[PDB]
Amino acid sequence: TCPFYKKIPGTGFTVDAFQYGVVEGCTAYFLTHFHSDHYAGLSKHFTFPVYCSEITGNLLKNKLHVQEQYIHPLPLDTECIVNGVKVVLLDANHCPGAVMILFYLPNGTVILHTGDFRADPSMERSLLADQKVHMLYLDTTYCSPEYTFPSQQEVIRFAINTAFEAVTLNPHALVVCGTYSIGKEKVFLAIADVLGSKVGMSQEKYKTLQCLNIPEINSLITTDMCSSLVHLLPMMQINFKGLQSHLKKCGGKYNQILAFRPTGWTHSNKFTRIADVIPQTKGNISIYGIPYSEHSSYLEMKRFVQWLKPQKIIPTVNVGTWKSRSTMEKYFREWKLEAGY
Ligand code: NI
């Protein structure tokens, strides 16, 4: 049945709750972002109001064929009224179109639902600074101190420098990047820009990117694989067998592959700096796993919460085991005692 952490008290609202059939009492279904664990259940047969960003609404119409009459896009950073309740959508610094949601309850309570997010100090100067938040529905994906990772900027610098060196040494090397959802576009777009190529991809993936309001996108992507030396493939194909196969398909235009797998966290992070990352190599194929995250590190999460000072925290991630829930609750108390709230 729908879990409590997907319901907003004192309203008829749910968040990212599309796989439970008709949730009894629900007058408006909010969707924070277009990732499958969150939209699971939507289709052209859905006949309740969906509230989301413009970009998530483009994807709902074009990719899942949700009928337009049920899509309610809201602009960001703008006080809106939904079924008599003031709400605001904020940038979540996750994937394109991803938002957090501020609810202003008729009784005076204010609730923030982070959706999936990567906390940033820039959030401390949004409309969040303007009033107190009583309850926080928190993306706790990496809520444990082992989860450190570098800035997105440091990761993209490593990727750009590695790709540029490789192709300048061997003008017959092909660069391949994995994907299985929206998000992490900067990885392949940054590499294509430094090499003076467009990124080549499948028609399905091309259609998905054309829904994202990215500036000058017609200039950066293409479905003509022959004219491109950065190819995007399913993440499943980023292994030695899949890459050898793809190389055969290119008809001897290329004699080497340099491939990137943008993972979240991997336990090479506890020890290894970004400067010291190495690939796995077999023959003329090298694969780099790079720690490009769209979720908060532990420290980023902690800073956000200690700045916000909520009265109650409700985790939305890693809630399925008693040891995980108990561990998170211990961190929340440490943070509260250290900061004084
Ligand atoms: Ni997500």
Side-chain angles (χ1 to χ4, degrees), residues 1-23 25-203 205-215 217-240 242-247 249-269 271-281 283-311 313-341:
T1 74
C2 182
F4 72 103
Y5 64 84
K6 290 189 180 280
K7 295 166 159 199
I8 304 301
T11 73
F13 305 152
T14 63
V15 178
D16 303 340
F18 291 95
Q19 64 174 280
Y20 305 98
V22 180
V23 175
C26 188
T27 60
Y29 295 77
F30 286 77
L31 178 62
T32 56
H33 65 295
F34 193 83
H35 280 161
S36 64
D37 282 355
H38 302 261
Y39 63 72
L42 281 162
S43 78
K44 72 168 73 166
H45 309 293
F46 199 81
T47 51
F48 297 98
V50 183
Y51 288 87
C52 57
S53 63
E54 171 178 23
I55 286 160
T56 297
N58 292 349
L59 292 157
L60 293 180
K61 180 190 168 187
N62 288 290
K63 299 292 293 189
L64 296 185
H65 316 288
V66 175
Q67 302 165 46
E68 215 144 34
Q69 77 177 129
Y70 309 105
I71 306 174
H72 300 259
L74 309 173
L76 305 188
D77 301 315
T78 303
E79 296 184 313
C80 300
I81 307 311
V82 171
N83 301 356
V85 174
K86 186 163 58 169
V87 307
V88 171
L89 305 192
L90 308 164
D91 208 280
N93 187 43
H94 184 53
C95 66
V99 299
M100 311 195 285
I101 316 158
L102 260 183
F103 302 93
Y104 296 81
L105 265 42
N107 82 354
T109 305
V110 173
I111 298 173
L112 179 62
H113 197 302
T114 65
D116 283 349
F117 85 145
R118 182 165 186 179
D120 196 72
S122 64
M123 298 171 172
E124 304 159 20
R125 293 168 280 282
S126 65
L127 301 195
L128 279 183
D130 294 27
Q131 75 296 280
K132 185 186 174 59
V133 173
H134 301 87
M135 306 175 80
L136 176 59
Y137 285 62
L138 178 66
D139 165 22
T140 45
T141 298
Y142 297 127
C143 189
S144 195
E146 67 271 34
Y147 298 109
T148 59
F149 30 69
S151 74
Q152 292 178 164
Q153 193 265 326
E154 287 176 78
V155 176
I156 291 302
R157 179 101 294 218
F158 171 82
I160 284 170
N161 293 355
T162 298
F164 179 77
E165 174 188 298
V167 180
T168 297
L169 290 170
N170 182 189
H172 300 277
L174 173 63
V175 177
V176 175
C177 294
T179 187
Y180 43 33
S181 53
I182 69 172
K184 307 186 191 184
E185 291 82 6
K186 198 65 181 181
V187 183
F188 51 91
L189 299 176
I191 291 168
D193 178 73
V194 86
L195 299 177
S197 176
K198 300 193 175 183
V199 182
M201 63 196 62
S202 76
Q203 298 177 244
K205 187 75 191 186
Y206 185 84
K207 175 187 185 176
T208 300
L209 301 181
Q210 282 295 158
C211 302
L212 304 183
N213 294 353
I214 288 178
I217 201 64
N218 299 326
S219 70
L220 308 149
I221 65 174
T222 186
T223 62
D224 185 358
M225 312 290 282
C226 292
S227 67
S228 159
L229 61 144
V230 183
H231 297 177
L232 290 203
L233 296 180
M235 197 77 80
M236 286 196 72
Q237 201 169 352
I238 314 301
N239 54 73
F240 297 116
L243 291 166
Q244 284 170 211
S245 175
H246 185 70
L247 192 54
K249 287 166 241 167
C250 291
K253 201 163 206 299
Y254 306 109
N255 64 359
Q256 177 184 10
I257 284 172
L258 182 118
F260 296 90
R261 292 186 349 83
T263 61
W265 162 86
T266 60
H267 185 67
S268 339
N269 269 309
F271 310 113
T272 302
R273 268 172 149 75
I274 191 69
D276 326 344
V277 170
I278 64 170
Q280 272 194 228
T281 294
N284 62 335
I285 299 168
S286 292
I287 300 170
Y288 285 89
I290 59 172
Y292 195 91
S293 182
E294 297 185 336
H295 295 272
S296 310
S297 65
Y298 173 88
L299 291 170
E300 297 169 341
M301 187 188 303
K302 176 179 187 280
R303 174 185 171 116
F304 177 85
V305 176
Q306 285 183 310
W307 169 81
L308 194 70
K309 306 177 176 53
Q311 299 175 356
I313 302 177
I314 303 177
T316 64
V317 191
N318 303 315
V319 298
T321 85
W322 296 118
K323 191 171 153 233
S324 302
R325 288 188 155 286
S326 180
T327 301
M328 294 181 292
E329 290 176 13
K330 295 176 26 269
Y331 298 130
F332 306 146
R333 191 56 61 174
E334 296 180 6
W335 298 354
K336 175 173 164 108
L337 291 167
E338 176 187 30
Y341 53 97

Short mmCIF file of all heavy atoms in Angstrom, two decimals, residues 229-276, unseen atoms left out:
data_model
loop_
_atom_site.label_atom_id
_atom_site.label_comp_id
_atom_site.label_asym_id
_atom_site.label_seq_id
_atom_site.Cartn_x
_atom_site.Cartn_y
_atom_site.Cartn_z
N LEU A 229 32.34 11.37 -33.21
CA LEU A 229 33.29 10.53 -32.48
C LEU A 229 33.14 10.46 -30.94
O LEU A 229 34.05 10.04 -30.25
CB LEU A 229 34.75 10.88 -32.80
CG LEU A 229 35.24 12.28 -32.47
CD1 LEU A 229 36.69 12.26 -32.00
CD2 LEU A 229 35.16 13.07 -33.77
N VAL A 230 31.98 10.89 -30.45
CA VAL A 230 31.46 10.58 -29.09
C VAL A 230 30.12 9.86 -29.25
O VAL A 230 29.12 10.45 -29.69
CB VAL A 230 31.31 11.91 -28.30
CG1 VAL A 230 30.83 11.61 -26.86
CG2 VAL A 230 32.62 12.64 -28.29
N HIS A 231 30.09 8.58 -28.91
CA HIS A 231 28.84 7.80 -28.98
C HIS A 231 28.23 7.53 -27.61
O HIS A 231 28.95 7.20 -26.71
CB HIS A 231 29.08 6.48 -29.72
CG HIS A 231 29.51 6.68 -31.16
ND1 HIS A 231 29.83 5.62 -31.97
CD2 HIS A 231 29.63 7.80 -31.93
CE1 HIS A 231 30.10 6.06 -33.19
NE2 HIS A 231 30.04 7.39 -33.18
N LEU A 232 26.90 7.65 -27.47
CA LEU A 232 26.22 7.34 -26.21
C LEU A 232 25.63 5.95 -26.35
O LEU A 232 24.92 5.70 -27.33
CB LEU A 232 25.00 8.15 -25.91
CG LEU A 232 25.13 9.56 -25.58
CD1 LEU A 232 23.86 9.94 -24.79
CD2 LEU A 232 26.41 9.81 -24.81
N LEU A 233 25.82 5.06 -25.39
CA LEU A 233 25.17 3.73 -25.46
C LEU A 233 24.48 3.42 -24.14
O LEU A 233 24.85 4.00 -23.14
CB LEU A 233 26.21 2.65 -25.70
CG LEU A 233 26.99 2.65 -26.99
CD1 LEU A 233 27.96 1.47 -26.99
CD2 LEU A 233 26.09 2.53 -28.22
N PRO A 234 23.53 2.44 -24.09
CA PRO A 234 23.03 1.97 -22.81
C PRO A 234 24.15 1.57 -21.86
O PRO A 234 25.12 0.95 -22.27
CB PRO A 234 22.23 0.71 -23.17
CG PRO A 234 21.83 0.91 -24.56
CD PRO A 234 22.95 1.69 -25.22
N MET A 235 23.99 1.87 -20.59
CA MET A 235 24.98 1.56 -19.57
C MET A 235 25.34 0.07 -19.54
O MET A 235 26.51 -0.29 -19.27
CB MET A 235 24.48 2.03 -18.18
CG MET A 235 25.55 2.14 -17.13
SD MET A 235 26.54 3.66 -17.38
CE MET A 235 25.49 4.94 -16.66
N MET A 236 24.36 -0.78 -19.81
CA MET A 236 24.55 -2.24 -19.96
C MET A 236 25.57 -2.68 -21.00
O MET A 236 26.15 -3.75 -20.86
CB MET A 236 23.24 -2.93 -20.39
CG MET A 236 22.19 -3.07 -19.31
SD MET A 236 20.97 -4.29 -19.87
CE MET A 236 22.01 -5.73 -19.69
N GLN A 237 25.74 -1.90 -22.07
CA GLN A 237 26.72 -2.19 -23.10
C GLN A 237 28.19 -1.72 -22.77
O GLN A 237 29.12 -1.98 -23.56
CB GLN A 237 26.22 -1.65 -24.43
CG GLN A 237 26.86 -2.29 -25.65
CD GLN A 237 26.20 -1.96 -26.99
OE1 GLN A 237 25.12 -1.34 -27.06
NE2 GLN A 237 26.86 -2.41 -28.09
N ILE A 238 28.39 -1.05 -21.61
CA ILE A 238 29.71 -0.51 -21.17
C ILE A 238 30.46 -1.62 -20.37
O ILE A 238 30.59 -1.59 -19.14
CB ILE A 238 29.65 0.87 -20.39
CG1 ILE A 238 28.72 1.88 -21.07
CG2 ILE A 238 31.04 1.48 -20.25
CD1 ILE A 238 29.03 2.27 -22.51
N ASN A 239 30.99 -2.55 -21.17
CA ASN A 239 31.83 -3.65 -20.71
C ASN A 239 32.63 -4.13 -21.94
O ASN A 239 32.28 -3.81 -23.09
CB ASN A 239 30.95 -4.78 -20.15
CG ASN A 239 29.91 -5.23 -21.17
OD1 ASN A 239 30.26 -5.89 -22.14
ND2 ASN A 239 28.68 -4.80 -21.00
N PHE A 240 33.63 -4.98 -21.72
CA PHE A 240 34.54 -5.37 -22.84
C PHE A 240 33.84 -6.06 -24.03
O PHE A 240 34.08 -5.71 -25.18
CB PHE A 240 35.76 -6.15 -22.30
CG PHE A 240 36.63 -5.32 -21.39
CD1 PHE A 240 36.78 -5.65 -20.06
CD2 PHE A 240 37.30 -4.15 -21.86
CE1 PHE A 240 37.57 -4.88 -19.23
CE2 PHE A 240 38.11 -3.39 -21.02
CZ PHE A 240 38.22 -3.75 -19.71
N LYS A 241 32.91 -6.96 -23.75
CA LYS A 241 32.16 -7.66 -24.82
C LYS A 241 31.29 -6.68 -25.62
O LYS A 241 31.30 -6.66 -26.88
CB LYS A 241 31.26 -8.76 -24.22
N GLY A 242 30.54 -5.84 -24.90
CA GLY A 242 29.68 -4.82 -25.56
C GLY A 242 30.42 -3.79 -26.38
O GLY A 242 29.93 -3.37 -27.44
N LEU A 243 31.59 -3.38 -25.89
CA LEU A 243 32.41 -2.37 -26.57
C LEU A 243 33.14 -2.96 -27.78
O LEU A 243 33.17 -2.29 -28.83
CB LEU A 243 33.36 -1.68 -25.56
CG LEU A 243 32.57 -0.77 -24.56
CD1 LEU A 243 33.49 -0.38 -23.40
CD2 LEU A 243 31.98 0.50 -25.20
N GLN A 244 33.65 -4.20 -27.65
CA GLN A 244 34.28 -4.92 -28.82
C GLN A 244 33.24 -5.02 -29.94
O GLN A 244 33.50 -4.63 -31.09
CB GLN A 244 34.85 -6.32 -28.42
CG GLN A 244 36.19 -6.29 -27.64
CD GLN A 244 36.67 -7.63 -27.01
OE1 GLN A 244 37.35 -7.67 -25.94
NE2 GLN A 244 36.31 -8.73 -27.67
N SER A 245 32.04 -5.46 -29.59
CA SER A 245 30.93 -5.53 -30.55
C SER A 245 30.63 -4.19 -31.24
O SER A 245 30.58 -4.12 -32.47
CB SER A 245 29.69 -6.09 -29.84
OG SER A 245 28.58 -6.06 -30.69
N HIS A 246 30.47 -3.11 -30.45
CA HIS A 246 30.24 -1.82 -31.03
C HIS A 246 31.36 -1.42 -31.99
O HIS A 246 31.11 -0.82 -33.06
CB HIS A 246 30.09 -0.74 -29.93
CG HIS A 246 29.74 0.62 -30.48
ND1 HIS A 246 28.50 0.90 -31.02
CD2 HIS A 246 30.42 1.78 -30.52
CE1 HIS A 246 28.46 2.15 -31.42
NE2 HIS A 246 29.63 2.70 -31.16
N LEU A 247 32.60 -1.71 -31.62
CA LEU A 247 33.75 -1.36 -32.45
C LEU A 247 33.66 -2.05 -33.84
O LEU A 247 33.88 -1.41 -34.85
CB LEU A 247 35.06 -1.72 -31.74
CG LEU A 247 36.34 -1.13 -32.38
CD1 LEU A 247 36.39 0.40 -32.60
CD2 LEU A 247 37.49 -1.57 -31.48
N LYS A 248 33.30 -3.34 -33.86
CA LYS A 248 33.07 -4.03 -35.14
C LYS A 248 32.07 -3.21 -36.00
O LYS A 248 32.37 -2.83 -37.14
CB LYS A 248 32.56 -5.46 -34.94
CG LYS A 248 33.55 -6.39 -34.23
N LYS A 249 30.93 -2.82 -35.40
CA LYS A 249 29.94 -2.00 -36.11
C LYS A 249 30.43 -0.71 -36.77
O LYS A 249 29.75 -0.18 -37.64
CB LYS A 249 28.74 -1.70 -35.20
CG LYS A 249 27.86 -2.93 -35.01
CD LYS A 249 26.85 -2.79 -33.86
CE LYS A 249 27.07 -3.84 -32.77
NZ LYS A 249 26.34 -3.57 -31.49
N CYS A 250 31.58 -0.17 -36.36
CA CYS A 250 32.04 1.09 -36.89
C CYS A 250 32.86 0.96 -38.19
O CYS A 250 33.34 1.96 -38.73
CB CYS A 250 32.78 1.88 -35.81
SG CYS A 250 31.65 2.44 -34.48
N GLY A 251 33.04 -0.27 -38.67
CA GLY A 251 33.62 -0.53 -40.00
C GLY A 251 35.06 -0.07 -40.17
O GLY A 251 35.42 0.54 -41.19
N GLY A 252 35.90 -0.32 -39.17
CA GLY A 252 37.28 0.15 -39.24
C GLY A 252 37.54 1.64 -39.37
O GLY A 252 38.61 2.03 -39.81
N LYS A 253 36.60 2.50 -38.97
CA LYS A 253 36.86 3.92 -38.82
C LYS A 253 37.76 4.19 -37.56
O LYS A 253 38.47 5.20 -37.47
CB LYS A 253 35.52 4.62 -38.63
CG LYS A 253 35.46 6.10 -38.93
CD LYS A 253 33.98 6.48 -39.09
CE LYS A 253 33.81 7.71 -39.97
NZ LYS A 253 34.52 8.87 -39.37
N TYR A 254 37.63 3.28 -36.58
CA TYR A 254 38.29 3.42 -35.30
C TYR A 254 39.05 2.17 -34.90
O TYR A 254 38.61 1.03 -35.18
CB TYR A 254 37.24 3.73 -34.17
CG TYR A 254 36.36 4.92 -34.43
CD1 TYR A 254 35.01 4.73 -34.71
CD2 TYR A 254 36.86 6.22 -34.41
CE1 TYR A 254 34.18 5.80 -35.02
CE2 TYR A 254 36.03 7.30 -34.71
CZ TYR A 254 34.70 7.07 -35.01
OH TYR A 254 33.85 8.10 -35.28
N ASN A 255 40.15 2.36 -34.19
CA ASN A 255 41.01 1.23 -33.72
C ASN A 255 41.22 1.19 -32.18
O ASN A 255 42.01 0.40 -31.68
CB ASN A 255 42.37 1.25 -34.45
CG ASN A 255 43.20 2.51 -34.15
OD1 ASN A 255 42.80 3.42 -33.41
ND2 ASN A 255 44.37 2.56 -34.75
N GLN A 256 40.45 1.98 -31.43
CA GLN A 256 40.60 2.09 -29.98
C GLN A 256 39.29 2.72 -29.43
O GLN A 256 38.70 3.56 -30.09
CB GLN A 256 41.82 2.96 -29.64
CG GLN A 256 42.05 3.22 -28.17
CD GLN A 256 43.22 4.17 -27.83
OE1 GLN A 256 43.80 4.83 -28.69
NE2 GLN A 256 43.58 4.21 -26.55
N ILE A 257 38.90 2.27 -28.23
CA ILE A 257 37.78 2.86 -27.47
C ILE A 257 38.24 3.30 -26.08
O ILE A 257 38.91 2.57 -25.33
CB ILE A 257 36.57 1.91 -27.32
CG1 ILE A 257 35.78 1.85 -28.63
CG2 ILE A 257 35.56 2.43 -26.24
CD1 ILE A 257 34.70 0.78 -28.61
N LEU A 258 37.89 4.55 -25.76
CA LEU A 258 37.97 5.06 -24.45
C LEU A 258 36.48 5.28 -23.95
O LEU A 258 35.76 6.00 -24.59
CB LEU A 258 38.72 6.39 -24.52
CG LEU A 258 38.88 6.96 -23.14
CD1 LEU A 258 40.35 7.08 -22.76
CD2 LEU A 258 38.27 8.31 -23.15
N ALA A 259 36.07 4.59 -22.90
CA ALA A 259 34.66 4.58 -22.43
C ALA A 259 34.58 5.13 -20.99
O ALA A 259 35.43 4.87 -20.14
CB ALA A 259 34.03 3.19 -22.57
N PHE A 260 33.49 5.88 -20.72
CA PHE A 260 33.19 6.40 -19.39
C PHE A 260 31.87 5.83 -18.87
O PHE A 260 30.83 5.88 -19.65
CB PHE A 260 33.11 7.95 -19.41
CG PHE A 260 34.40 8.62 -19.76
CD1 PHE A 260 34.71 8.90 -21.09
CD2 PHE A 260 35.31 9.00 -18.75
CE1 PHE A 260 35.92 9.50 -21.41
CE2 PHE A 260 36.54 9.59 -19.07
CZ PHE A 260 36.84 9.85 -20.39
N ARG A 261 31.93 5.31 -17.62
CA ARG A 261 30.76 4.88 -16.80
C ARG A 261 30.61 5.86 -15.63
O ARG A 261 31.33 5.71 -14.67
CB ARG A 261 30.97 3.47 -16.19
CG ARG A 261 30.98 2.39 -17.27
CD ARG A 261 31.03 0.88 -16.95
NE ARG A 261 31.31 0.54 -15.58
CZ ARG A 261 30.40 0.50 -14.62
NH1 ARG A 261 29.13 0.79 -14.88
NH2 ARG A 261 30.78 0.18 -13.38
N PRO A 262 29.62 6.79 -15.67
CA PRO A 262 29.44 7.75 -14.58
C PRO A 262 28.60 7.01 -13.52
O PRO A 262 27.38 6.87 -13.68
CB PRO A 262 28.66 8.92 -15.26
CG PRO A 262 28.53 8.54 -16.68
CD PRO A 262 28.64 7.05 -16.75
N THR A 263 29.27 6.42 -12.56
CA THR A 263 28.65 5.69 -11.45
C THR A 263 28.27 6.75 -10.39
O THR A 263 28.69 7.93 -10.50
CB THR A 263 29.67 4.69 -10.87
OG1 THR A 263 30.83 5.38 -10.37
CG2 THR A 263 30.12 3.71 -11.97
N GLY A 264 27.48 6.38 -9.38
CA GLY A 264 27.28 7.26 -8.21
C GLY A 264 28.55 7.26 -7.35
O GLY A 264 29.52 7.96 -7.65
N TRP A 265 28.51 6.47 -6.28
CA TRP A 265 29.68 6.18 -5.46
C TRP A 265 30.19 4.78 -5.78
O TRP A 265 29.39 3.87 -6.07
CB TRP A 265 29.32 6.24 -3.98
CG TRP A 265 30.30 5.55 -3.03
CD1 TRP A 265 31.43 6.09 -2.47
CD2 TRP A 265 30.20 4.20 -2.51
NE1 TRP A 265 32.04 5.17 -1.65
CE2 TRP A 265 31.31 4.00 -1.65
CE3 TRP A 265 29.29 3.14 -2.68
CZ2 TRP A 265 31.53 2.79 -0.97
CZ3 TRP A 265 29.52 1.95 -2.00
CH2 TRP A 265 30.62 1.79 -1.16
N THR A 266 31.52 4.62 -5.74
CA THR A 266 32.19 3.31 -5.64
C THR A 266 33.35 3.40 -4.61
O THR A 266 34.09 4.38 -4.62
CB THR A 266 32.69 2.83 -7.04
OG1 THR A 266 33.62 3.77 -7.60
CG2 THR A 266 31.51 2.64 -8.03
N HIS A 267 33.48 2.40 -3.72
CA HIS A 267 34.51 2.30 -2.62
C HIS A 267 36.01 2.56 -2.95
O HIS A 267 36.85 2.52 -2.04
CB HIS A 267 34.36 0.92 -1.93
CG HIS A 267 35.24 0.72 -0.73
ND1 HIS A 267 35.10 1.44 0.44
CD2 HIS A 267 36.27 -0.14 -0.52
CE1 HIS A 267 36.01 1.04 1.31
NE2 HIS A 267 36.73 0.08 0.76
N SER A 268 36.34 2.82 -4.21
CA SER A 268 37.61 3.50 -4.54
C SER A 268 37.69 4.98 -3.99
O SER A 268 38.79 5.53 -3.89
CB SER A 268 37.91 3.44 -6.07
OG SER A 268 37.19 2.36 -6.74
N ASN A 269 36.54 5.59 -3.61
CA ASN A 269 36.44 6.98 -3.04
C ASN A 269 36.99 7.20 -1.62
O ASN A 269 37.41 8.32 -1.28
CB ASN A 269 34.97 7.48 -3.02
CG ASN A 269 34.56 8.22 -4.28
OD1 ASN A 269 35.24 9.15 -4.71
ND2 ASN A 269 33.41 7.83 -4.85
N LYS A 270 36.91 6.16 -0.79
CA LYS A 270 37.45 6.18 0.58
C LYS A 270 38.96 6.40 0.61
O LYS A 270 39.49 7.06 1.52
CB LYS A 270 37.13 4.86 1.31
N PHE A 271 39.65 5.86 -0.39
CA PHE A 271 41.09 5.95 -0.52
C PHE A 271 41.45 6.95 -1.62
O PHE A 271 42.04 7.98 -1.34
CB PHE A 271 41.65 4.55 -0.81
CG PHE A 271 41.14 3.50 0.15
CD1 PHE A 271 40.30 2.46 -0.28
CD2 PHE A 271 41.47 3.57 1.51
CE1 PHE A 271 39.82 1.52 0.62
CE2 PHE A 271 41.00 2.62 2.41
CZ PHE A 271 40.17 1.59 1.97
N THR A 272 41.01 6.66 -2.84
CA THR A 272 41.54 7.32 -4.03
C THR A 272 40.91 8.72 -4.35
O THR A 272 39.68 8.90 -4.39
CB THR A 272 41.47 6.32 -5.23
OG1 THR A 272 42.23 5.15 -4.88
CG2 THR A 272 42.04 6.89 -6.50
N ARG A 273 41.81 9.71 -4.51
CA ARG A 273 41.55 11.03 -5.16
C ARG A 273 41.17 10.95 -6.66
O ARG A 273 41.50 9.95 -7.32
CB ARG A 273 42.82 11.87 -5.08
CG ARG A 273 42.95 12.77 -3.87
CD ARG A 273 44.36 13.36 -3.85
NE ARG A 273 44.41 14.70 -3.26
CZ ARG A 273 44.34 14.97 -1.95
NH1 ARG A 273 44.19 14.00 -1.05
NH2 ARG A 273 44.41 16.24 -1.55
N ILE A 274 40.53 12.00 -7.21
CA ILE A 274 40.12 12.03 -8.64
C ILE A 274 41.37 12.02 -9.52
O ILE A 274 41.41 11.29 -10.52
CB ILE A 274 39.13 13.20 -9.00
CG1 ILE A 274 38.53 13.04 -10.40
CG2 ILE A 274 39.76 14.59 -8.96
CD1 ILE A 274 37.56 11.88 -10.55
N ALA A 275 42.39 12.77 -9.10
CA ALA A 275 43.72 12.76 -9.73
C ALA A 275 44.30 11.36 -9.98
O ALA A 275 44.95 11.12 -10.99
CB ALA A 275 44.70 13.60 -8.91
N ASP A 276 44.03 10.42 -9.07
CA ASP A 276 44.62 9.08 -9.11
C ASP A 276 43.71 7.98 -9.72
O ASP A 276 44.01 6.81 -9.54
CB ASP A 276 45.05 8.62 -7.69
CG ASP A 276 45.55 9.76 -6.78
OD1 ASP A 276 45.87 10.86 -7.27
OD2 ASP A 276 45.61 9.54 -5.55
#
